[PDB]
Amino acid sequence: GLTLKVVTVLEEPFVMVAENILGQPKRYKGFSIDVLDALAKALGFKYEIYQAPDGRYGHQLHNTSWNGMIGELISKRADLAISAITITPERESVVDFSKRYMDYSVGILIKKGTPIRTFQDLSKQVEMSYGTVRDSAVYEYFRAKGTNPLEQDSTFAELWRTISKNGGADNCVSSPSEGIRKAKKGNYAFLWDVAVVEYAALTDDDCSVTVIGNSISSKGYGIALQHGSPYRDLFSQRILELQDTGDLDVLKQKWWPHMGRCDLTS
Amino acid sequence: LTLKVVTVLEEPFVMVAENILGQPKRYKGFSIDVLDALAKALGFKYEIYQAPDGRYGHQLSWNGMIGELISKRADLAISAITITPERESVVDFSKRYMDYSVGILIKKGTPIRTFQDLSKQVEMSYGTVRDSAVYEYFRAKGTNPLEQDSTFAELWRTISKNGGADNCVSSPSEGIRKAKKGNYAFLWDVAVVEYAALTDDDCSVTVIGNSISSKGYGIALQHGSPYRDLFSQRILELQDTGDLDVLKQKWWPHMGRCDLTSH
């Protein structure tokens, strides 16, 4: 029957590999998979998932083309893209996002037991390396806030001076997995999606790391569809219903356990 | 192009501005400034009118602003309208231009600093507007066995005492008035009670938030409107540049007004 092609990128606990037995297609699991499954059921479609061949969310290149999942949508190789995709104006100009199914903000992952408790505390650091994924939306977030003397505090300017040192070479990482691994080794603080670093801290074998939030949320996570897709408004309606009934809250408790895991209190 | 805009008064989203006798009513506020930025960005003019029953809208068909859009007397509706699935099924909302959540309005100087602390109260009156969406939110959360902390169950036990008659109020203005006179905490739209606290004549109240947002505020357009996606795109741009945050600081200003954190 009606089958949608879904492009994704691995991001814990939004989209993870579940099993891949030889001969069988790869299977996936996670919070975004469960939201997608609820939509598939309600709207009566099937789907097939593939990972973005370049592994990127996607951004705009100099000739106005896009790579990543965004590019897959523009080219119509994918009908929808889902993982932990932030709804931004640049991306919405070329694809069509559903209304959000979760809020987004940036957090800090750092080993427990330090005097750093806030973004402001991190910005005061003189010797400490900290950073984000180079070439990411989070890097571009700190560029924007850091190069804006119109902010009310030097916090973002100071954070940007460390993050962007040597064009991002010294203090940034290639992937969230590298940032998480470095934060656990100590002497590094990793700045990334708070939901991603919270999951990493909750599942740390040694319960050795904690997350600093406090970022005000102004953006959400969405399902990206093709420009002009008829499914965009249908998805939004059902997402709103999932939120109103409490079904989304249950799925969040499933992947970010309120209890049973590491205690994140430093 | 001129769009018909329907609204309802809600400080500081939409407020009456001063107008010369005989001149049409003027409006000002956070939502008005968002509307103005959309007009300038997209290049339209507009005329505003007030909903005849001063209601947002609910069904049993739709009244309030939702009804004006359904009937097509309005091209769009804006004030402090929350994006809900029941409303989105009959009209078309922009993506949100601000987050919504429920807060606590309470007199300064108590040991209550969180929703959990409020839920621990014995013999204290606290509540919300009777038969409101907020009441229904606390019903749903408070009766759900899958909640991981007893906080919501305990809040519901007090809010719904005697079918909601003992501890709930008839309107937000009454809830605000009761919290200011004491021996009551009022649970309502955090942006609304924050503004009430900032402008309290006696700078006597504070607001407890510490709640992830449940919903967004949106611009409601007609079902099938050609403008909805355009509005969403420009709203996202206004958020990303910080323009909306500047507008929020402008309409919920903190210096010159009451200090909400003096204790």
Ligand SMILES: *[C@@H]1O[C@H](CO)[C@@H](O)[C@H](O)[C@H]1NC(C)=O
């Ligand atoms: C756009 O730029 C990218 C990166 O250089 C390139 O791979 C792609 O072929 C270009 N496409 C054009 C000219 O349409």
Ligand SMILES: [Ca+2]
């Ligand atoms: Ca779009």
Ligand SMILES: [Ca+2]
């Ligand atoms: Ca120590």
Ligand SMILES: [Ca+2]
């Ligand atoms: Ca693990």
Ligand SMILES: [Ca+2]
């Ligand atoms: Ca449409």
Ligand SMILES: [Ca+2]
């Ligand atoms: Ca309201």
Ligand SMILES: [Ca+2]
């Ligand atoms: Ca609709």
Ligand SMILES: [Ca+2]
């Ligand atoms: Ca006291």
Ligand SMILES: [Cl-]
């Ligand atoms: Cl929204």
Ligand SMILES: [Cl-]
């Ligand atoms: Cl939308």
